[PDB]
Design a protein around this ligand. Sequence first.
Ligand code: 145
Length: 151
Amino acid sequence: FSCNVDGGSSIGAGTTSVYVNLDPVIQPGQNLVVDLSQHISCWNDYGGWYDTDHINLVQGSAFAGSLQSYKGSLYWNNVTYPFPLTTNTNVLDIGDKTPMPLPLKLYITPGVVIKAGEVIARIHMYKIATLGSGNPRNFTWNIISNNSVVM
Ligand SMILES: O=[N+]([O-])c1ccccc1O[C@@H]1O[C@H](CO)[C@H](O)[C@H](O)[C@H]1O
């Protein structure tokens, strides 16, 4: 099982920065959207649904931190969860070699509120396959804005 960010080199585990362009202003009482399907994709390294991968997001995934005071929602594969995550999400099954953009969106409920270049969320993703032990692996996606977000 492998992923990449913005079509870059393959990733098999570990922590990766994911840079995102956000709305430069965050309106009071309105959600700021961080569409991660636009950046992260993963695939089965054989294809053909032979050793199918099973992917979920993990309890404890949260805002960073410093910025933990915020609340929000995390959309993952047909379900919208409160964020930070207090439980593991549903499982997404990956069996094609064609990359699948992750069905993942973060919603952030509100001078500069978000600083470009700082980690603003840490999303832990868990993989286990089907054959043998399943060869479980952990990924962490460190979400970083390319731009300031204000008021
Ligand atoms: O993870 N890999 O870098 C990798 C590259 C080529 C072939 C298998 C492979 O890993 C294998 O992939 C299969 C299907 O995705 C399962 O995830 C299995 O657990 C993994 O070891």
